[PDB]
Write the structure tokens for this entry.
Amino acid sequence: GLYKRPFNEAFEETPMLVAVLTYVGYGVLTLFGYLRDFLRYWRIEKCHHATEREEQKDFVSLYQDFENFYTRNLYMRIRDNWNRPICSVPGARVDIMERQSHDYNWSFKYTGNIIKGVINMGSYNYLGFARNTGSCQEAAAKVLEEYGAGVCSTRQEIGNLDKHEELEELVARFLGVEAAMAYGMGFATNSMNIPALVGKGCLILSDELNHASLVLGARLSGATIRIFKHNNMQSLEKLLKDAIVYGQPRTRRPWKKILILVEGIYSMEGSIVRLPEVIALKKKYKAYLYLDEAHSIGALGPTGRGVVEYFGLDPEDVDVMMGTFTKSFGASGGYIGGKKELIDYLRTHSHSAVYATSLSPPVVEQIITSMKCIMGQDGTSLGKECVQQLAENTRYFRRRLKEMGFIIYGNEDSPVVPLMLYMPAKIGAFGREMLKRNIGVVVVGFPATPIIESRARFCLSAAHTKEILDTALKEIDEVGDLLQLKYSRHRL
Amino acid sequence: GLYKRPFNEAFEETPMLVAVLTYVGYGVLTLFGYLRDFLRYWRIEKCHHATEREEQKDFVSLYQDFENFYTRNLYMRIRDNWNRPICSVPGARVDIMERQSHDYNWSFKYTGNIIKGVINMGSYNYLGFARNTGSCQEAAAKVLEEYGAGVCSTRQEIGNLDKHEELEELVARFLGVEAAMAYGMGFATNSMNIPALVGKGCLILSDELNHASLVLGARLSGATIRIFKHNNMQSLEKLLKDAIVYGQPRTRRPWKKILILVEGIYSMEGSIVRLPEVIALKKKYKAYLYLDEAHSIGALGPTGRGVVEYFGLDPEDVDVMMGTFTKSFGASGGYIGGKKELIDYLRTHSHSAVYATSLSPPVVEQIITSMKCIMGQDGTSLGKECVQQLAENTRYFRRRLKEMGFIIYGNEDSPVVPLMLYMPAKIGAFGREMLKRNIGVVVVGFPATPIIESRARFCLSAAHTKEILDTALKEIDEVGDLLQLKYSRHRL
Amino acid sequence: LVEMVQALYEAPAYHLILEGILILWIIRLLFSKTYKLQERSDLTVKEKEELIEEWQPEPLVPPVPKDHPALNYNIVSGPPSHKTVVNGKECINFASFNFLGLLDNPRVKAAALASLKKYGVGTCGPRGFYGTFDVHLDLEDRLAKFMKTEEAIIYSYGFATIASAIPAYSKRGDIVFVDRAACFAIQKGLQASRSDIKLFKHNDMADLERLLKEQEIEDQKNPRKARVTRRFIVVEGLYMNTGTICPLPELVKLKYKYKARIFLEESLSFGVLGEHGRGVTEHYGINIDDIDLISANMENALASIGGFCCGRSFVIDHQRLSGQGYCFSASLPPLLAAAAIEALNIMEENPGIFAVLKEKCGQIHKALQGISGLKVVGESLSPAFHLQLEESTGSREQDVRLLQEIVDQCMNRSIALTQARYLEKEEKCLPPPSIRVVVTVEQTEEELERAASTIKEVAQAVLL
């Protein structure tokens, strides 16, 4: 496979002193956690937690204490950077209800005041469709008035509606594939459709950084799972060759099928899949392709059709194209697109098609209106300005942060910017300092990530004006000076 | 598979003292051989052998000296027990030209006298068809007068005759199979037809004691060869299971074919193949059967049809039935019998069919007359008396030798009696002593056999009267007393 | 021996060390049971290429038969409610799990519209990352107060609720005793966890007692392992596949006598059983604290998307960090949460609707009895039960075709019925084909008796 445009990405290595200090901090935390566990065991310090009821003291303990170690000693200390409630539409600016804790985050009390106008860098609205006033809101209100909220049956039963058929045909037109199906949850799409496609005797080749839904769907099916390195075509080719040559593990037999699970944009890493190479490899080795396109279906592409348009490829080349409406379109749900035979087999043999309640009418109406606006059916100039503004904002923000001396992961095109903190205390410090300056960010620590890289994720949007980006950048520069977060050696 | 009649065989183990003395003798011989080699190398003792011509002293030596060790030091000492010329028809009594050596068997000089009336226990005429006067001799003389001796072309060329077609149809009738083909040499049959049936990618399962022709034919083809223990159905079944399950050695793939090479009667051991078990195993595991029937085509069976009649089985069950006319019928040649498609493929794609001269007319006439006499076409009572006399002689001789205290191998039905000597010097001693008493036997030593068992083979015949057997038995008893050859512990 | 010991002591140290290592070497040879052959072979590039070329994969999806009954979806031209239009034919809904008729109340729609105006449709993130609204906490508090329980947790999807609640507590090495007739969500939850599964006969405490006794016998053998093995009993308040209730008091006695926790699934019985409609616990009078975890979905009775789990804080707080459908998925849209809150308010205001539903179920179940070729499966208290073939053919396809014939003929008679759908290859215990009858407080007595008469006529005409 060949690229029509340059493919630039950068993952700078950790400075050695930073790694040493990270290990020092983690060791200190582990030792003090052991001390606190010892104190709590002997009742020297009263434990502030719920316990089993007295009538069940002779039962086997429900949990294992050691599994909660990092929860009791690391997560609880910086627990206030997560689960922040909001009382407004998650737009470019959000309102956050203020809470305080008096027992070191073991319990939160709610103060009456409300933080207002916090710059939103944590929500997922890439194209800025999360609004309480607009055409989509009016369409959703009309459909809510007519159809009500929620359906009380299943698709194979009386619960199939006309709105669902309209949504499916419109989605099939939008993607360019022959047919598509819609489900009521992005997680459920994978978890309930991957077991249908493959089973015992097939091989699944999964990338190193797949979402939990893809992994759960692969585990639910009886197929064999092998993991290759993230965006490493050499590893993928080696695994494909070994799988085809050496056959099944115990009784050497040809594999019934080979399925490759990949993603469009990896949220935490910030990278874009090398789709031409994957397509070439699967054509050479006769494998099937499953493409999770949740983070790129609206963000990427000149017209916002996804990764396949970004690389200028043919949608007919990808066997299964899954996607989610939550990120870009501003409404819950998910979809799978492909050939007509695949869609018919899924309509017949899908767990969510038989046992799960279908979508809600207002949600499908909002999706329909948003996607019509994106493809330009309404005729208004909107739908192209959003994509252009998203691209400009991404380019400007990434360039400005890279020229400030920070370390940033991923491609130059992805609208997800992982800033690197590298130390356990700087996670909570960054979260609290950025909230103090009216910026809302998301911070990710050790057990989610590898040990040395802990990060903060910025999600850009088409609703972010230039002044908002400038304010956020100056505050980020001030905080980076305060916390010494400018580890980059190349430029500073 | 099940036997309609009891299947008795006995292979008594070597006494431990006998084994120790055998090793003592072999060690003494090896040490003195090394001493003689050292003497010959330094020209201390003049070497009585031919050397390379003086013009080729700078060439690389033609042979390797060490390979001739056992030839120079063990074979040459007792060399006079082999290659004994005869000047008479190899009947029940034969005339042997007498020779003497003055340099310890390094050269033989021929005396004028001729030993007369030596009881023949070395020739292969089982049914006593080796006669210079009879109906077969007259038929052979007439065909020699008409057709001449020898044909000067190949079967695919102008060298195909009507006698060959008559012989092939008569052989097909005799065996009971659909069709058969005839060749001019028993060794050539295997060596030139086994490579045609199988090739690279097929498996050949060969018994532990196959003839050299079968081994050479298996080596000429590119198939893989695996050897199982002699008449060990457990080993054969284990090899079949492993071959079917684990596939080809390097690139695990299903075997193209599986062929099992077995023999009817093993000459040196004296045993008969467990045909029902082999047939059952090949039916269960879908393998093909090649049955060498050289020693049993005339000796075994109520009507002398071979092993398949001896066990009362169906000839259609064996894929390929090869045989030789040399042993029982008293004329050279060989044959392969089977289905019509197999015979046509062999007529088209056999090395001896394309490149080798066909049989001789007098030989085929002698074979035809002998086999017609055996099957009773002439109407004379002969042809059944021969088989009955062979059976009685075998039973009487084996019982009489077993009740004398000797050790004997094989079934009670096989007309081949291996007597056991167990020591290197007793080989030559037995040969010379038995010749001194007018009995001709065959003795087999170490490199042909395993080290501890060296033997003497008696070949019984239908032409051996009762008085001949009694004389031979009394002489054998006297010699066994002289040489202490009665090692049997069970009866003596 | 003593002289040998003295002679050994007379030896130098290095000599004895050498002899000792030699003896260790001898032991290694004696116990070197592996008979290595000393060979090594590797494939060739052309061999690898030809092996790659031979291989031919199967198609992604198998060829489809055109006779699939599930290939044809009923199309509803409008909201699924009383007096709906199915396939262009005006009918009366007897197929949608809308027990209290809360789908089309003006108050529910007004609350949903107000929340839609305030917040919008999407939440744009998980509960961890700026996806928690005040409506979510309000609904959790309302559910906890309604069920008289310490805490509740909300999932945005009915299946994922139990399918993620079960694997969070049961891990590899534990023992789960699950009823044979358990919904597909429970089966997938039990498969996601790697614990040992022991099925017992439907509503049979004899088999449960036998299995618990066998487990205690196994515990007596290895007490150390038995001190780190947890035991769970997963049951449903009102079974969907059979329509039968479960015997709670015997289950509670078995729990307290064998030290095995209880997980209750209450999708069907959440808003239909009990005087105040709090589930089967009110129906049997069992204390709420005896049941460790109660899981339900907000779709059947509350008429909105989502699901929830209720229990003590000690058990509920674990799901906020171990439930996969909660941690790695977007939160419920605010308008659905507001609709659920309004439905809870309506249910709390007047509890007579449960009595009305109970009496309607009694009437319809009594009236339906007497069909020649069909038998009613289910209890009189169940809002949804089944009609099954008394005498069936050899194969299942003919049974399905006969039931679909009955369904179509009834639908032409202004009665909208549905047939139970299953995944044949996936279900652990496949129920017989049946026609599903669902009762709603919207339905009048005359409509119920008309439906009974129509079903009787059509069934006796078709089966004959």
Notes: The interface with chain C takes residues 249-251 of chain B (CB under 8 Å). The first helix of chain B runs from residue 16 to 41. The CA atoms of residues 392 and 462 of chain B lie 9 Å apart. The first strand of chain B starts at residue 9 and ends at 10.
